[PDB]
Design a protein around this ligand. Structure first.
Ligand code: HEM
Length: 137
């Protein structure tokens, strides 16, 4: 289930973080507007970039904490507020987060592993709702 998936992702987090974030950037190419440093590079090139590895790891470290602190896939309001107020997230809208979780869920469904993809879909929808409640447009 959801709680085991958090453990699975954490057990190989740098790899999952890079592969899911690449799935996001490749499924939604326009999202690179927010990550100009990753324009014009193949996946293998990004996976050799220190900034790419460190960004994706820090993102998924925090995402897994938010997932771990949720109850029944409902995130804490404090975690939603943090994500909205982070200076790095100024100007983002909830659609950006919807797209990240669409890619995450599709990655899980295409994976050979028994991820609880429906729970991650629900978690993403509930996080989007909480971000909106916390003031993200
Ligand atoms: C639950 C989802 C997300 C989490 C947990 C998260 C977390 C983080 C963290 C921890 C950082 C600091 C690492 C760094 O500065 O490189 C960061 C930066 C950033 N995030 Fe997110 N983020 C999420 C979703 C998004 C989405 C959907 C977007 C845009 C589509 C986005 C855009 C950015 C940008 C532009 C930065 C600054 C990157 C840089 O300057 O290197 N984030 N995020």
């Amino acid at each position: 289930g959801f709680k085991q998936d958090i453990a699975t992702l954490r057990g190989d987090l740098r790899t999952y973080a890079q592969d899911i974030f690449l799935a996001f950037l490749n499924k939604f190419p326009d999202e690179k507007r927010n990550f100009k440093n990753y324009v014009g590079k193949s996946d293998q090139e990004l996976k050799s970039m220190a900034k790419f590895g460190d960004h994706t790891e820090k993102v998924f470290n925090l995402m897994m904490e938010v997932a771990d602190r949720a109850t029944d896939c409902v995130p804490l309001a404090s975690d939603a507020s943090t994500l909205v107020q982070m200076k790095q997230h100024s100007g983002l809208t909830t659609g950006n987060f919807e797209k990240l979780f669409v890619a995450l869920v599709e990655y899980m469904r295409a994976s050979g592993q028994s991820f609880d993809s429906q729970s991650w879909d629900r978690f993403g929808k509930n996080l989007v709702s909480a971000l909106s409640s916390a003031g993200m447009k």
